[model samples]
Target: GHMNLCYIDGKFLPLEEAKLPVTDLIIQRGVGVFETISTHSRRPLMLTPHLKRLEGSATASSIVMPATLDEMARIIREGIKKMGCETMVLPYITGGDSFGKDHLFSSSRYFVIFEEIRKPDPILYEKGVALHPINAERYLPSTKSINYMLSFTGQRDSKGAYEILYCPEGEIVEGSHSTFFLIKNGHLITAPTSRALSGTTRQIVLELARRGNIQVEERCPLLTELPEAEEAFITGTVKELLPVVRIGDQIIGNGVPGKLTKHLHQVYLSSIVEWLE
Candidate 1:
């Protein structure tokens, strides 16, 4: 299949030609921010919230805003429309290029890159997947920084684990780029927004759980408590709601996707379809 296009430097170009300067902080020191927004029927889902979070990331990273939130949204919409498929849109902001090795930059850079969306394996959804927990935390828990060395290095030899769960100080924080959730005694538990990245899908899932009268507990689940969790899952742009059958050597619930987890996933899908309408 042919590749889609990207919006950069005030122009749209072939995805393969979308390039960044070597002097840009994103390539130099990983000083950049981005948000992953996937499309549904050519419409980017919850773009406002994702861009809002990206703004937060840019501010925390000391990177200037390249454009207003509405402008970014419009650019992303145009990009996705041109992609002609359910695409994964990423709006990126870098600290810009420079001559010296310091933080000073000529101007902040913003761009939009996208690709056709790819769903996870159907068999994995039916049986659920395992997670390899690593004791780590993002430098700025709230900002979606471009750096991911921790997860990249941690999952190097994880065998067949689908995701790397972040367990900072023995507390179940979240997955590599996904928010973590656990069901305990009928209550839905997860790390607070202050502790995790506050993913877009996480917010939607929590809202759905509330509408369905599912109890919620906004706190980290202890490593010691994994054995008793009735169900668990991770939420992200690509992974809307993927169940987790095991964490390390401990199996969750009946060693499969639990009833409540599956129900929430179904409702999540329905909500998206309704949103598209």
Candidate 2:
């Protein structure tokens, strides 16, 4: 009998039992920041970086942090043990309850929620997946804000798409939930941090590529360049370097997962063991 649990306001309880006041800015104005951390062998992977990014997001969003990273990590570690399995951990900081626009007068709210790890379908990784490109831009692209209106809107009409790619003007910046990458002429290419979310898994993959002697280009690839691409993939907490065989209707590199994508993914999985220790 598994329980859906969360650590909220310094207390651990059933996720459904935790409640936010109706007046909270997180509900009223969608003011909050969060980060996702996945576990391996019941230990969170890159937890420090994920927590740092959460703090950075909270700071950038002007949401007061209720606890330090160390404190949060302790709570997360406890929560992980309680779950008794590998899980996906989400740390959220909210702008707090505010009746008027004076958010400074209100106390912030923090939560750490736990969910069962949901890996994408195994066949999708084996046969690869598709992406639907949409024209949009985030308000605070650097901050992991709670507002995902644009991404949700883009997804509404994206039929049979694994992920949505945000391509403003003609350059494919990144995916709504994952970071985009392409292999062109044997070089690994992706958008710079300034142009995309500084995803934890993205940093790991880039490091793996360089350490493995693969060249990398930190620039957003053009939508027009899709056809010339040799291969493509995306990375995230759960979607760890998944291959992308199709962008809309355009098939990539013989319409199959590329060799380098598989190699980097293997190294990425191997790195998790050392990361947990």
lDDT of 1 by residue, 144-184 (tens): 98887877677677777887888888999998788999999
In TM-score terms, candidate 1 sits at 0.94
Candidate lDDT scores, in order, read 0.84, 0.85
- Number of the top lDDT candidate: 2
Residue-level lDDT tens digits of model 2 in 1-277 = 1476889867899988988887778888888888888888878998888888888888777676788888998998888888888788888888887533743524778888888888889998899999988877665778988876766676688888887898889788898889999999989989999989999888888888878889999999988998899999999988888999999878998999999899899888877776662
What is the overall TM-score of model 2 with all chains considered together? Answer: 0.95
lDDT (C-alpha) at residue 51 in model 1:
85
| Model 1 alpha-carbon drift over 4 Å, by segment | 98-106, 273-277
Span of ten consecutive residues with least summed lDDT in model 2: 98-107
